[PDB]
Amino acid sequence: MTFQIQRIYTKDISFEAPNAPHVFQKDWQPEVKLDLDTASSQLADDVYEVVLRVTVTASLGEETAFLCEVQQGGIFSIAGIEGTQMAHCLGAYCPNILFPYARECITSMVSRGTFPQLNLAPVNFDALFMNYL
Template identity: 60%
Template sequence: MSEENAQSQANQPQFAIQRIYLKDLSFESPNSPAVFSKAWQPEVGLEINTKTRSVGDDLYEVVLTLTVTVKSDGDSAFLIEAQQAGLFLIKGLEGGQMQHTLGAFCPNILFPYARETVDSLANRGGFPALGLAPVNFDALFAEQMQKQQAGEKAEQQH
């Protein structure tokens, strides 16, 4: 391989999953066993958050937090909070590309793991699996960027 080819490959963006792991997990069922004697009519609330931090040379930790609140017949059935994390090697990306990778691409990779954890934990708590619907992290990221830009414009006007 020529030196020129080696140099051009070194400048190419690189992305690799180093590890996917469960960082934190919580389950609460405050009204059990009474909740099991009522008709199961679940009202599911889902809150999604992500956090990103640099942990070394080109290594980034992304933590996807799912908070699932389920009520049935007006009573709290259970609450699950799962922090699914990943360690990613990312080289050669800057600015908007890096923000998109950390804010949308990585959470997209982590979500199926978090969804499986939530389903499994609901089952272990005596409840049916939730089968959370897929999430469009690209759309959530775009919405967040629009809000951030609108906030910056508002600050500039004051």
Template identity: 55%
Template sequence: MSENQTQPQFALKRVYLKDASLETPAAPQVFTKAWQPEVNLDINTRSTSLDEQHFEVVLSLTVTVKNEGEAAFLVEVQQAGIFLLAGLGEAEAKHTLGAFCPNLLFPYAREAIDNLASKASFPALMLAPVNFDALYAQQLQQAQANGGETH
């Protein structure tokens, strides 16, 4: 092994709630109606380099719940983490930041959303697991289609 090669390293250094909000625009009337929710989940991720080896990854989830066609509540959570990545190739690092890290953050974000919904007096809202590898692959395909061929 040459001196400039580094063994691959990965570590989760910190997990934190960066931002959270809850809106209940239909309260208190929403509590007087039969509960048949329609749940919509929007997911977004972004990563920022903090230095050569540390990255902040932010998983943003927006959950809109409608009941009888009316917005019952809206929860937005930005769950973040600081990750150490070293010795990875560019493609491996992008995949790790775009799929693996959000996968680690998702259970924390899901718990935050469930807690906020419960505190607003709504039934538990346990979001189904998300396949971040598939979402990342889909983003790569869209980027290639929009930007031509990439290598």
């Protein structure tokens, strides 16, 4: 086969601390909720675009601490592979490459908002793909 990463970029970034000023009085580890989405598309022949969307909802007590979302995209060149092997390349292999980027983006945004450190636990995309089927 043939695989080549052509570009990696953030298509969309969002961070919100609606109750920010006053919710700071609540100093502790906020309950976090993570959500993932992966969608691809063919930009040209053997040139695809995979997008990884990661949403993190956090709350302190009974109120929102912050909401953060990121859509991390990448352009890849895939050849030789096809059928199921391809579905797995774009649905698990590429998102796995992009996860570190989205993860860091979220960590950076959370840090900018002056909230407690937030490190997304590693995700097994291979396992997640096995549930998509």
